[PDB]
Structure formats: structure tokens, C-alpha cells
Homo-oligomer: A and B are copies of this chain.
Amino acid sequence: VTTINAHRSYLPGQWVYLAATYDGQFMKLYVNGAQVATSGEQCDDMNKINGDGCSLFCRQEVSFNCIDEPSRCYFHDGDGVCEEFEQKTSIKDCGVYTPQGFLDQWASNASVSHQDQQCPGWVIIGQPAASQVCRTKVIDLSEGISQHAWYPCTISYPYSQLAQTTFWLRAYFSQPMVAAAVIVHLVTDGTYYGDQKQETISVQLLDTKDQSHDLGLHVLSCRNNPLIIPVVHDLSQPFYHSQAVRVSFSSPLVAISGVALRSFDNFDPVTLSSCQRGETYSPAEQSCVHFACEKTDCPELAVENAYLNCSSSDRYHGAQCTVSCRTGYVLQIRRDDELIKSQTGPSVTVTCTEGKWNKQVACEPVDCSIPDHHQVYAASFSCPEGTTFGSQCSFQCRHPAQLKGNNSLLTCMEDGLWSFPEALCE
């Protein structure tokens, strides 16, 4: 048999409307014309009577949803159907809220300081009981609290030795994942008559290298269920995984329903390995490959008066080829046909990119510049083929600077300097 209760307490001395409808598949309960509960095992209500979801001021009450015209209002928190907007509020229906682009992994195994049959420590494993609203200023924890939660049952309430009892619990997950946030769903807030002050829980994250990273001290309250503790990471430092989460507190009344790690979807720091541009990380192989389905093949590239040495026989994706200039030629490298930083060394690495080359390399000859009085004074340097490498051309000393010698021509040498004048005029 299945029973469904109303939404609020009965009001003495009032007229109420009760309607129960059962079609053989679904049964519902209607109070004052409004659907309060249903199971299958702003507003205008044509009245000015409260309790049916719409007040006399035509205002929708809390924990009610009103549709249609005239407005019919029904209860949505706990009805068993997770609507498009119940995720944020209705914990008892949709569980916990997972933001778009995140994944929540709940605790797989748990280790606590005090393990006993009546208060087992493996209750905070798996999905918690989000339908349980926490209890404030609780006196006894023997009713259902130990069923879907954990608490130090073996430890009585301490009055003087409570300052030295360091309660701790460590939760290990099946898989290691980068910790973006820590979810702590509670069932107790730690408030008590004998201990008015609450308890602040400090959470420590344990990595795969057994190192503890402190997340700081954070307060704990019922209004913040589930308690989301962000993981503040220094972006300059490399990311680190996490496999175990440690929760530390001193108040024996602190009971945790569940501990979970909220992480991003993919781009894990496993891909922080040697998987750079030109290759795609494998689905699950602990390694990165470069040819899954990409047809990114670049055509063979040749540079005039230059030396090319490719690291691979074929100029396929990820193939880096070193380019150097012949003696008497300078190296000019332009990334994506644009002016960028040059290469100090005599070799430039060019990588294939989806049928195109990342940078263009040119071995232009070294210009020796137009000669002047620096090389030979009182002379005219008239010569046809410019001032590039190998482009020899002569001079003529004007009157009265008579020139004596067999040769009176220079030659722009391989080091970018004009050759020694074999004859000097006086």
C-alpha cells in the first residue's frame, strides 16, 4: 500500500475541499482544488482563499507551481518528477545539482577513526540520501541517522576532552580525477545546547603521490547543503590529480551523508603529458597518438639554395624538418606569412599543418651593401648586378687618383663583406 500526505498542517476551523482521483494507474490527492501529492504505484484561481496555491492578492505561494489559465497549482518538491527547474531547489527529487560542464564522482570507499557495527564507516560511499533534510540541535542520533550517514557513535559527547579528539574520515574514489570542487552533503549541522558554537570542517585533498593539499577552514550549516568547497589552484603551478579526500572536525555531532569530487569533463591532466600540437590524445591508452582519422598530409616543400633535412621520410602530420642556408645566404622565417621572432641558430624547424606549412623559410642572399669610401676612397662604384652574394663588381678611381694593379674589382663574399681591393689608387 502507498500513502501520500498533504503539503502543510491542517488548519482548525476551516472549510476544505478534498479530491482523490485514481484511474487504475495513477493516484493523486487534491486539497482545496490544488494537487498536493501524486504517485503512480502570477496566478488566478477564481477565488480569494489561501491554501490552494494562490492567495487573495493573486500571488503564488511557496513550493507551488501554477500553470494554465485559470491557474491550477500543484506541488513539485518531492512529487517524483524532476522538472526543468527543480534541479536547483528540489534536492529530494533530482538529488544534487551538477553544473553544465562538470561531473560529480561520489565516494567509493571510506575509512573513519572509529568503526563499529552500530555506526559503520562505509555509509558515506556511493550516492547519498539527498531526500533527508538535516536536523538542528538534535539530541539523539539513534533513529535513522546511522542508517544513511556516519557519525562517531562509539564516542560520547565530550565536555573537556573534546578539544583533543581529532575526528577524521578519508574517502577514496574508483578513479583519479582533478579536484575542481568538494561536495559535502550533510545530515547534521553540529549545533547543540551544550555546544552552541558550530564546527568548521577543514578538508584536505590527497593526490596519487600521497601528498596532502589543504583547502582551508570552512563553516558548516544546514542552509549550505550541499556544502561546495571550491579548490583554488595556482594556475602557474602544474595541475595535480586527487584520489582521496580527507575531512577533519572535532565536534562529535558532525555527520556527513556524502563526500564527492566535482571535476571537469575531459581535458584531464593526463593529457598534460607529451601530447602537443600535431597529435590527438587516445580515448583510453595512457598515451597520445598522431594518426587516428586525420588526413592532414602536407605537400613536399623545397627551398632554393638551401639544405633540408626532415626528421621523417614522409612530410606527414607532426613531421618537423630542419632548414639551413647555404654559405652566403641568410635565414628568414615568417610564421603564417607574418613577421615574427627570428631564429638565432642556423636551422629553422618547420612542421606540417593540415596540408600547409606552419612557417615559410627563405634563404635570401646576404647583401654586402653599396660600397663607399670605406672600401676604396675617391672612387665610383658603378656596377650592374647589385650588392648581393657573389655579385662581383668593380670601381674606378676618379682623376687624379691613378690606380695601379692588375685587378680592381671586389666580390661580395660569403660572410657579407666586400673582398679586399687588389689595387688602391693614389
- Provide the A213-240 mask, 1 if CB < 8 A to any CB of B, else 0: 0000000000000001011111111100
User: Distance (Å) between the CB of A273 and the closest chain B CB?
Assistant: 8
Interface flag for A110 (CB, 8 Å): no
Q: Mark A382-409, 1 if CB is under 8 A from B, else 0.
A: 0000000000000000000000000000
Does B235 lie within 8 Å of A232, measured CB to CB? yes
Q: Is the CB of B281 within 8 A of A277?
A: no
B262 touches A271 (CB 8 A): no
Q: Flag the segment in A64-72, A83-91, A176-184, A371-379 that touches B.
A: A176-184
Residues of B contacting A354 in the complex (Cβ-Cβ under 8 angstroms): 283
Residue in B127, B236, B266, B283 whose beta carbon sits within 8 Å of that of A275 in the complex: B266
Q: Give the contact-size bracket for chain A.
A: 20 to 34
Copies of this chain, tallied across the complex: 2
Which of A237, A267, A272, A277 has the most C-beta atoms of chain B within 10 angstroms of its own C-beta? A267
Q: Does A276 contact B (CB under 8 A)?
A: yes
What residue of chain B has the Cβ atom nearest to residue A292's Cβ? B293
A237 to B272, CA, bound (A): 20
CB atoms of A272 and B267 under 8 A apart: yes
Q: Nearest Cβ distance between residue A48 and chain B, in whole angstroms?
A: 39
B271 adjacent to A266 (CB under 8 Å): yes
CA distance A272 to B267 in the complex (A): 8
A235 CA to B238 CA, complexed, in Å: 13
Q: Is A194 an interface residue (CB 8 A)?
A: no
Minimal beta-carbon separation of A359 from chain B (angstroms) = 16
| CB proximity to B under 8 Å, residues A252-268 | 262, 264-267
Instruction: Report yes or no: B236 in contact with A180, Cβ–Cβ below 8 A.
Output: yes
A273: nearest chain-B partner, CB-CB: B101
Q: Is the Cβ of A235 less than 8 Å from the Cβ of B233?
A: yes
In the bound complex, residues from chain B placing their C-beta under 8 Å from that of A272 are 101, 264-265, 267
CB-defined contacts of A237 to chain B, threshold 8 Å? 230
Question: Is the Cβ of B234 less than 8 Å from the Cβ of A230?
Answer: yes
A284 — nearest CB in chain B belongs to which residue?
Answer: B354
Q: Is the CB of A181 within 8 A of B283?
A: no
Q: Which of A95-142 contact B (CB under 8 A)?
A: 101, 127
Q: Which B residues are CB-close (under 8 A) to A293?
A: 292-293
- With A266-B271, A266-B275, A280-B281 given, is the CB distance from A232 to B234 under 8 Å? yes
Q: Given the complex of chains A and B, what is the CA–CA distance between A354 and B282 in angstroms?
A: 12
User: Is A341's CB within 8 Å of the partner chain B?
Assistant: yes
- A242 → chain B closest CB, angstroms: 11
A238 to B102, CA, bound (A): 10
Residues of B within 8 A of A264 (CB): 272
Q: How far is the CA of A222 from the CA of B262 in the complex (A)?
A: 41
A276 proximity list for chain B (CB < 8 A):
265-266
Q: Are A271 and B267 in contact (CB under 8 A)?
A: yes
Taking a contact as CB atoms closer than 8 A, the residue among B178, B231, B232, B236 that contacts A181 in the complex is B236
Q: Kindly list chain B residues whose C-beta atoms are within 8 Å of the C-beta of A280.
A: 280-281, 292
Query: Which of B228, B232, B236 contacts A262 (CB under 8 A)?
Result: B236
Q: A180-B236, A232-B233 are in contact. List 7 more A-B contacts (CB 8 A).
A: A101-B273, A127-B341, A230-B236, A265-B272, A267-B271, A283-B354, A292-B293
